[PDB]
């Protein structure tokens, strides 16, 4: 399993609220 | 498995709530 | 596992909140 | 610029020569 | 300048000659 | 300038010759 995720040249302003994670990659990811 | 998730020039804002995260991956991902 | 994250040239403010991580990657990630 | 390459899976074998590299990138790749 | 060069499950042999490198990247290379 | 380069699970073998590097990366790489 191979993963690349690259973000270049982002704006991200007002994210009052639960900012997780941008990016993220795991073997297994679950949400309950 | 091979991902590749690239983001260039993005504008995000006013993003109230629960942003988990913009790009994600894994060899078996699910939401309960 | 092979987890390429790369970012580059960001702005974030504003982020009033609970602020995990911009980017974060494991072998199993899960949210309860 | 962004470069992605992944390459999962070869056989070489019998490559008398001058190899140079399976995989090569760069911003500007000239050959005299 | 983003490079990601992964390589997984390779087999390499009788290889006799000049192997340079199976994977390079830089900003400017060039072969005289 | 990023690089990432990353290699696993590989057999070379019989490699009589100038084996150079398996894996090289820089800001300016020329061969004369």
Do not use: F, P
């Amino acid at each position: 399993l191979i993963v690349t995720q690259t973000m270049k040249g982002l704006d991200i302003q007002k994210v009052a609220g639960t900012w997780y994670s941008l990016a993220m990659a795991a073997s297994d990811i679950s949400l309950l």
